[PDB]
Design a protein around this ligand. Structure first.
Ligand SMILES: [Cl-]
Length: 288
């Protein structure tokens, strides 16, 4: 019957500093009638897409008291399908204690495939649609999908590297991570600046827990997030300081199949949300 031109973009080697928003408006204006996007770089770390918006920043408009998690993204992609290969996407805002949540990829398309992609941030590095049913804090979901329906998505990440500290893979998606390196980043004691003296050490706020890798809000019936043959490593987190998962919503699901865990991973594996030491019995966390 007929042929149609599809949208595929190459990003040269180098760093591209921009906030990419691949929404309905982008597709209509570029005549992408199948609302699908393929992006390609010159190699996982030779091409870098980069921005530095953080959730605690000033609000850019009359909406919200702050920029917000879900407006923090370096790249947002929606539509029927998104494919991303051979590049890095980073949010360089920094430590979540200072700049707040800061998304590298807001992955919102019904089908998402990432091959040989490096995602870098700290808190909330990778977000996979959908959002939970209801916000826990006022305005918490302000962003592209705040008032959109909670559509399920299906996501595959192959030979990727994903970095962060706190809830850095999160959302309600059905997602598979296959042969990925999952890097927990150390959260250093922060100096209390009002304790600076001339001849004496300052005081520091230590961190009880170094991080949680995965924070799903999986709906009841869906399989949710699966890590397969993935490696969990750290830069310099201390032993037994990191949890694989905590349930962002009561019934979140995360499974780890034939994964290898560095010694930064706590032997209990999974943390509660309310209470780190009491995992809500409704969570679906498994290590096979
Ligand atoms: Cl897929």
């Amino acid at each position: 019957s007929h042929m149609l031109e599809m949208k595929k973009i190459f990003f040269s080697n180098g760093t591209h500093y921009q906030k990419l928003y691949f929404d309905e408006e982008y597709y209509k204006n570029n005549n992408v009638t199948d609302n699908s996007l393929h992006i390609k770089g010159a190699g996982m770390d030779v091409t870098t897409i980069s921005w530095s918006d953080g959730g605690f920043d000033k609000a850019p408009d009359d909406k919200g008291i702050k920029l917000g998690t879900f407006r923090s993204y370096t790249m947002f992609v929606s539509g029927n399908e998104a494919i991303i290969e051979d590049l890095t996407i980073e949010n360089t805002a920094g430590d979540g204690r200072i700049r707040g949540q800061a998304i590298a990829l807001y992955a919102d398309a019904s089908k998402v495939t990432c091959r040989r992609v490096h995602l870098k941030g700290h808190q909330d590095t990778l977000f996979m649609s959908p959002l939970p049913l209801t916000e826990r804090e006022k305005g918490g979901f302000i962003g592209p999908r705040e008032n959109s329906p909670r559509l399920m998505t299906t996501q595959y990440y192959e030979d990727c590297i994903i970095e962060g500290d706190v809830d850095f893979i999160f959302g309600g998606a059905n997602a598979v991570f296959k042969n990925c390196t999952i890097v927990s980043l150390y959260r250093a004691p922060l100096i209390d600046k009002n304790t600076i003296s001339k001849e004496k050490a300052a005081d520091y706020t230590d961190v009880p827990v170094q991080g949680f890798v995965c924070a799903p809000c999986t709906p009841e019936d869906e399989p949710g997030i699966r890590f397969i043959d993935c490696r969990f490593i750290t830069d310099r987190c201390p032993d037994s300081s990191v949890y694989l998962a905590r349930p962002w919503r009561e019934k979140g699901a995360a499974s780890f199949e034939n994964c290898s865990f560095g010694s930064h991973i706590h032997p209990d594996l999974f943390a509660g949300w309310k209470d780190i030491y009491d995992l809500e019995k409704t969570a679906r966390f498994k290590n096979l």
